[PDB]
């Protein structure tokens, strides 16, 4: 079902990728695909880390909203299902 995601890479220079766009998800056909969003929230301000396709992950099953649940991490990470679902992201305090 999830074939495309919003793409973002802040570390694009060292990783030799594009900085932004749309990522088509490479599916092995026998597995679920998801989208993900990752960012830093150093006192209210958002510094986007990465956005892209995420492989078959039990944590992401049937999640339409990209919600980061890890409490007070250095980097927030969420995953979701559905095309471009990582367009919107939030964290659960």
């Amino acid at each position: 079902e999830t074939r495309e995601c919003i793409y973002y890479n802040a570390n694009w220079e060292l990783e030799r990728t594009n900085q932004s766009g749309l990522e088509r998800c490479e599916g092995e056909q026998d597995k679920r695909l998801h989208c993900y969003a990752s960012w830093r929230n150093s006192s209210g301000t958002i510094e986007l880390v990465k956005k892209g396709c995420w492989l078959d992950d039990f944590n992401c099953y049937d999640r339409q909203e990209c919600v980061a649940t890890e409490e007070n991490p250095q980097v927030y990470f969420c995953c979701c299902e559905g095309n471009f679902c990582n367009e919107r992201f939030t964290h659960l305090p």
Epitope: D56, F58, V75
Partner: antibody, heavy 114, light 112 residues
Framework: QVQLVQSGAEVKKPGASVKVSCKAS????????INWVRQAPGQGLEWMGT????????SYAQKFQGRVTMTRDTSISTAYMELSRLRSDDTAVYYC????????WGQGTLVTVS | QSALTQPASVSGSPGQSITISCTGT?????????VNWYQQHPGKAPKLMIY???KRPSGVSNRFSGSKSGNTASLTISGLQAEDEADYYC???????????FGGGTKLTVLW
């Protein structure tokens, strides 16, 4: 095809540290977790922990809390597992495996603590 | 982190069916479709045979199937063959909110 290739066999003295590497190819390294597992001679599989290569977040098994460090270098699609204050019974084959389902496994790394 | 219990060993004859059990509780096996099975041949790395209780990856023989009843997940091997002789481990999904655990493993012997 999807492949995880680990660093070679290592021999360590008790009290030393070992760093095992896990090189991912045939898929986007940042599209899934890396899990670490070990297996002592003639014993079962033991989970060590997971790393999220996107965020750098880790979760360690209780047994290793305080002496295991998991890192990654996304520029070279490589995950690392460092185990400190080595003891004679840390002699094991250490594995990395892809994602939460451990769908592809590295060939394993024998670490002998003598 | 909760322990998963497997029998130490199971033996079978060629062509027979064998079932390996992985027992947890209602808070783990009984609540989540996240039990997986790994085959390990002598001197080799484990291989994923079944994931998510009953899902078979492509490449895995259709003689391998997985199921769950109550708090016990089961791996069934139909038409037992010599190459099935190995250690089998059950385990749960590991990552994010899920802490990894493996069962103690089961040594499967195929008696020729």
């Amino acid at each position: 095809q999807v492949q995880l290739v680990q660093s070679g066999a290592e021999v360590k003295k008790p009290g030393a540290s070992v760093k095992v590497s896990c090189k991912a190819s045939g898929y986007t390294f940042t599209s899934s977790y890396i899990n670490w597992v070990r297996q002592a001679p003639g014993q079962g599989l033991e989970w060590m922990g997971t790393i999220n290569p996107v965020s750098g977040s880790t979760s360690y098994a209780q047994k290793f809390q305080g002496r295991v460090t998991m890192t990654r270098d996304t520029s070279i699609s490589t995950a690392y597992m460092e185990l400190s204050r080595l003891r004679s019974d840390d002699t094991a084959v250490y594995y990395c495996a892809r994602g939460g389902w451990f769908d592809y496994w590295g060939q394993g790394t024998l670490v002998t603590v003598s | 982190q909760s322990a998963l219990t497997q029998p130490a060993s199971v033996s079978g004859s060629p062509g027979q069916s064998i079932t390996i059990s992985c027992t947890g509780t209602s808070s783990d096996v009984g609540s989540y479709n996240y039990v997986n099975w790994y085959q390990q041949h002598p001197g080799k790395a484990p291989k994923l045979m079944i994931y998510g209780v009953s899902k078979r990856p492509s490449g895995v023989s259709n003689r391998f199937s997985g199921s769950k009843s109550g708090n016990t997940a089961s791996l069934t091997i139909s038409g037992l063959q010599a190459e099935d002789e190995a250690d089998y481990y059950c385990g749960t999904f590991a990552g994010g909110s899920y802490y990894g655990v493996f069962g103690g493993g089961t040594k499967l012997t195929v008696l020729w």
